[PDB]
Amino acid sequence: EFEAAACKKYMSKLRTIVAAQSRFLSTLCLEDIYTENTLEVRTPAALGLEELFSPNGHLNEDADTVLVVGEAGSGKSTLLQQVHLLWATGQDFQEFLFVFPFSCRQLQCVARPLSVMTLLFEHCCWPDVGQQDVFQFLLDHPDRILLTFDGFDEFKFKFTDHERHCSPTDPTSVQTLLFNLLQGNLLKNARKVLTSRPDAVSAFLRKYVRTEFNLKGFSEEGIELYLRKCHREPGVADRLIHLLQTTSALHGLCHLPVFSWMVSKCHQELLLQDGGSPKTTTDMYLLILQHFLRHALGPSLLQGRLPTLLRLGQLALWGLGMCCYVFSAQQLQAAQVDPDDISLGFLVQAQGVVPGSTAPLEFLHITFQCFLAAFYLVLSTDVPTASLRYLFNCESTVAALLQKTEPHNLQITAAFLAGLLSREHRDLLAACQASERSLLRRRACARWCLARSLHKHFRSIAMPGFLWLIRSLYEMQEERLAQEAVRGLNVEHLKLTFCGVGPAECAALAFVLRHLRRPVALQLDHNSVGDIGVEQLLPCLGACKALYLRDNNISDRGICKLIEHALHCEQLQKLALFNNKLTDGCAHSVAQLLACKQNFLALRLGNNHITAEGAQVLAEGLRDNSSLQFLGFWGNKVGDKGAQALAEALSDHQSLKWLSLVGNNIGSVGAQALASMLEKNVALEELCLEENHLQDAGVCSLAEGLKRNSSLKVLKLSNNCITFVGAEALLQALASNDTILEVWLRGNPFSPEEMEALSHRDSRLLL
Amino acid sequence: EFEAAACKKYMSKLRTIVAAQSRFLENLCLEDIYTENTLEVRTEVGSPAALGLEELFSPNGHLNEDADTVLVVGEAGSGKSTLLQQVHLLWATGQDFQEFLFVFPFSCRQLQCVARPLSVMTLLFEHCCWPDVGQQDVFQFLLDHPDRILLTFDGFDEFKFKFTDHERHCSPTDPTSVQTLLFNLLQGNLLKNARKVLTSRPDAVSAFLRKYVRTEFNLKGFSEEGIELYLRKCHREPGVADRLIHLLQTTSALHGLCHLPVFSWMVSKCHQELLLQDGGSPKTTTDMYLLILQHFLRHAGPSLLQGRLPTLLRLGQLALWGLGMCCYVFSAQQLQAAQVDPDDISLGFLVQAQGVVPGSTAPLEFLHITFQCFLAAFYLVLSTDVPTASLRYLFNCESTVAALLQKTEPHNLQITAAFLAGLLSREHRDLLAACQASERSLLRRRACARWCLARSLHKHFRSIAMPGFLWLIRSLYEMQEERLAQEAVRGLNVEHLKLTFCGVGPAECAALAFVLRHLRRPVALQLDHNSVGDIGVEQLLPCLGACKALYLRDNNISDRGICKLIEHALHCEQLQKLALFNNKLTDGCAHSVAQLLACKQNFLALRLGNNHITAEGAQVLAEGLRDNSSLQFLGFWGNKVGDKGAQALAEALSDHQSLKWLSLVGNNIGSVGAQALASMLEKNVALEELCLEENHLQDAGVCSLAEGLKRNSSLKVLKLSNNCITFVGAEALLQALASNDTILEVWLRGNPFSPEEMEALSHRDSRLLL
Ligand SMILES: Nc1ncnc2c1ncn2[C@@H]1O[C@H](COP(=O)(O)OP(=O)(O)O)[C@@H](O)[C@H]1O
Ligand SMILES: Nc1ncnc2c1ncn2[C@@H]1O[C@H](COP(=O)(O)OP(=O)(O)O)[C@@H](O)[C@H]1O
């Protein structure tokens, strides 16, 4: 009664506040700006925001802990802000009566020990009325509670922290408090959404996560939407979109929302188009720096506010080394940042829902904290050059802080440091030095470390940290240095799978890998390279003997652009494109590759959307090829008519050893065409024909061609609706054939008795 | 003698009964209610031509036994059952179709339920009407004069045929299955040359069946005028009709739904509630069926629904069982099994078969097939006996529920699915909130439906049809979730959307707007040969911004429509082309067309052929045409701008920088216009093609045209077929063309040339095309 009123009063308060805090950006109105983000669930299937607790079509209270993982600036904080807003405005996730948003970096700073009660009430929302009754309700209905913990990487746990605790009201450390939330010891079956950077997700943490999502940023289409949403003024969006389509390196950076935001903020400067456009990450953060400086001259401009920038950078560096990303009034006075420093706009009020007033401050984004720390490291006279060794591995307070800084922060900071010591950025910073050779003294140290950086790496064997060293070399923009770093590295296979490689990472890889002496087998499977990342990679393609681009969201436009350049690459021989968005549209380009390039060896094209129409177009070039060995179509649908055109081209073909047509919806019209091939063909050693409607009629004409064959060794026929007559028609033919090593008839309709008698009749038949 | 008397006695009985069964829908009398329905015949020259009810066996001006099987096709609630009832009544009362001595009406869903095998004799006599006298003689007469027999089979989709059914059978008296019986009726094995009218939904069996049909009609529903008539016929009470008609004119979405008679009926039934207003008016289909639900519940809000929940669930269960067993009529024994008491029946969703007398132990059926689909959806949403995996089977993406849904006919399954979506809308979920077992029960179902619907359009295009696409658009609409419509179109790179002959009306337009406005890349929307009309234009306006082109051929659009279209089109940067060939436009639109040309600086194409634009309007639009500097194509094929109109256009185009193509075919243009057009050609540097066929240009016209052509050097194609040009105007042209190096083709087909003159002309210049 009173109790009910009390809760109903609380639910209103909680909504009103959560709504208020979530409606606008720390960086216009969220409802009008939120552009949808490529959200993937790990299997790796895509899905929308609203399906966060129903990825596979049903609300499952089972997966009580959900984990969203993504790079810095991928849009995790913003994704939660939308969820909160959808909920607080009654639009979605209404299965929850209460949602409690938390900022882990803020909870990290809490000195005292706390209970579940003081967590919700003192660090989120305090019930105006009937506090004890409301808490009872929450304990009695935990399954109606969502908790969100933004930036889970910014906690620091301890073995002390890892202990059991079951009381809602008994105080304890914050860290052990979550441990027990995730354990289900507290608020069992309440839902928990955690966002994190990639390197902080753990062994003992992933032990608890029932569902894991990956936030991969804006798609190429997504970028345009964002810019159209942000720039309503007549035709301004159109000119930016045109600019990006004609400035590949920049267009690539924009896949990460934080960079799309920066381009929008800096449009005016960019549209002028004088001179050049930014291409590196440091380029962009320097542009945004100057945009800000204008509002509150070029190098003169920077010099104008140098004391401010140094004081912020000092705070920022202290922060990184103390794993502290939020700052209190007392700490700002200590760091001695006046309100002219704050007003510049790199420090913004902490965005968190916490009771009343008043909120501590934090950097506009974690990466601005890393950037300004790098800025300070470059220019402050308090920073000894010998301490920059700790940024790249190769003593003092500065060195002390860098040792204690989290690696993922340290890496960002290092890449910026490199970038700021580039030839051009050193001219820009020239007015801010103290000594006319001050920036050169620092470069001397950085360049030196970076030269040994890749040799140092491989000589202690991981691959995430390698990618960051490639990025630093890129940022510095020194070509002779990239040359020095790969000099002598005898690298054959480069494994970079699940490394979060996008276009901007591709740009850096091209910059460095093109100087490789011995040609490399580059493996980028399971990333988000895309069509733009292909364009960025092209400079190093000459240094590739193989290119593996599985699961990379590459389309016809990408592969055609790839093949265009691939034709002039003598080294390049293999090319895997399994599980992308290719269609018949690429078939003409693939035909050229096969026709013209006499060096080629392998070409896996499975799990795209190639049909009978395209199969024919490509088979034309396949006839004129005389080098190819492997060819894959697993999961396409070339069917009877496509199967036929390939078979006809391959009967004469001198080199092809392996061929997959699994799941291509092929009947006995194709089986016959393939039977003709086998009679003539002397090269083909393996033929995968699983998951097709070949039938007894198909297998029989296939066994017929096999009597005239003496090259084929492995013929895989699993799951074709083959019965014990097609099985025999095959066996009879095989009694004569002395060349065949294996024949698969797994998962087919046969009586066990039938199975008995096939296993005996010929000893090469499998299940 | 006795035989003749016997037949005559039968013909009377059959008439009397068929009349009796057909006179009422009861307070209502058919003769007083039947409002005429837009009936179209399919022609290979397709658009399809319109016609009246009475021309069902004479669509183009003559009777014919030749087409013994006629097929009327229409959407659910288009008015097919009612159309046959009128035919039967016209016949039985001696008014029309008197070429038939006997008419035998049948309900396919009822014949589907007959257990025993039957002969042609027991079909007509036992399941239609039994001859009081001389049964054997009467049957003989029927076998001897089959060409005087009409058979009507209402709701042909509700049969279920089999391979076993498809076998030969020639005896009239030997029993057999009902299904093989119709196979042989259609094949002509039985009662050869007897007439057969079949009504059906659009996607029911059509292969063997279409092989058999000679004439096919389409029933497209009430016109805008038709709706008013119906409401005036239904509401005689003082000024009540006037207030509903006003309500519809000021509530577009609803007014659009009413084009389908079943919705006009619902609005009439629910007028009292609608007139009260207060709550916003319904706009989706599920809105309407929920309103009619509450109307019924009142007589026997969420509290209201909760009151009779057990009833509604028992009906829905019956309904779902019915759909999955392809059974749409229910016997006393089956109702007791399904356990619907008389409180359930009395509610009013169950009704007697049309022929049957009230309250006899007669089987029952749902008020309409769509109410069976609606209540099935209702049950699917709320019953605790129903699993969410079952809902997956609604959209494609185990248990006895899943089993039934697999066996349900697709066309029924689609309706049911759209309702399901609708009932899980934000608002309708509040309304249903009182009826849930579990406070998160409706949300668990939405989670499944929303998920399937998100992938539904991607799933569709990735297996290539267009009828089933339109149903998915409708489900997304019904659910009324904007972020979902956004999700569904995400990543669909669609350029050209072909939706011709898809039966697209206003309510379909409403749904298309709702979804297509979220397209990222602008689309070429093609709705040629539908019934969009003026209301459908109004409903489409939200997605117009996402169109680069709009094609609205043969859509019965008037001045009111196009003016409303142009009003919004002016603020659409993407929209560039706009085809309106074969509609009801007149000079009245000319002012609006002038604005479009004047103001919209990036327009490209504007086809306006086969309307009723005259000289008067041609002048009004030419004003804006002068201030246009982007247009490329412009068409008037089949209008009548004539000499005065031709002149005003020519004058405006002489200065015009962009226009490449111009058609003035069949515009009744003489040599006064030809001269004005000659002046144009001298000056004009842009125009590359000029179509002037089917006009009275004459030798005098061609000569002044050849004169202007001497000064011209841009024009490439000049089409002059069928202008009564003789071998002097032909020469006057040729002389001029000896100098002109720019012209590629010149058409003089079908002209009064003698063959000798022809040979010479063909020979003199390669370019003249004869
Ligand atoms: N879905 C989105 N729509 C629009 N802008 C976004 C989106 N996600 C991120 N951004 C932009 O990028 C900036 C940083 O994103 P953020 O969510 O802080 O990334 P993270 O927290 O994962 O580092 C935001 O200020 C916002 O402007
Ligand atoms: N021509 C018409 N005139 C008046 N009312 C009609 C007409 N056609 C249909 N209706 C109304 O709509 C209802 C449904 O029509 P019906 O013929 O059953 O559609 P169908 O059989 O095509 O599904 C009828 O009961 C009637 O009230």
Numbering used by the authors:
A (entry chain A): 193 to 219, 226 to 241, 253 to 505, 515 to 612, 636 to 702, 715 to 1020
B (entry chain C): 193 to 217, 224 to 244, 252 to 505, 516 to 612, 636 to 702, 715 to 1020
Sentences from the paper on this structure:
We also generated a construct in which we deleted the loop regions encoded in residues 245–251 and 626–635, in addition to the removal of the CARD (OcNOD2ΔCARDΔloop), because residues 245–251 are not conserved in zebrafish NOD2 and residues 626–635 are susceptible to proteolytic cleavage during purification. We crystallized OcNOD2ΔCARDΔloop in two forms (form 1 and form 2) under different crystallization conditions and determined the crystal structures at 2.3 Å (form 1) and 3.3 Å (form 2) resolutions. The asymmetric unit of the form 1 and form 2 crystals contained one and two NOD2 molecules, respectively. The structures of the NOD2 molecules in these crystals were essentially the same, with root mean squared deviations (r.m.s.d.) between 0.4 and 1.1 Å. Since we observed no noticeable differences among these three crystal structures, we refer, hereafter, to the structure of OcNOD2ΔCARDΔloop in the form 2 crystal unless otherwise noted. The crystal structure showed that ADP-bound NOD2 folded into a hook-shaped structure with dimensions of ∼70 × 80 × 40 Å, consisting of a NOD domain (residues 195–744) and a LRR domain (residues 745–1,020). The NOD domain can be further divided into the nucleotide-binding domain (NBD, residues 195–425), helical domain 1 (HD1, residues 426–485), the winged-helix domain (WHD, residues 486–602) and helical domain 2 (HD2, residues 603–743), similar to other NOD domains with known structures. The LRR domain of NOD2 consisted of ten LRR units and formed a typical horseshoe-like structure in a single curvature, with α-helices forming the convex surface and β-strands in the concave faces. ADP embedded at the centre of the NOD domain bridged the NBD and HD1, and bound to the WHD, allowing the subdomains to be closely packed. As the resulting structure of NOD2 folded into a compact tertiary arrangement, we concluded that the crystal structure of OcNOD2ΔCARD is that of a closed and inactive conformation.
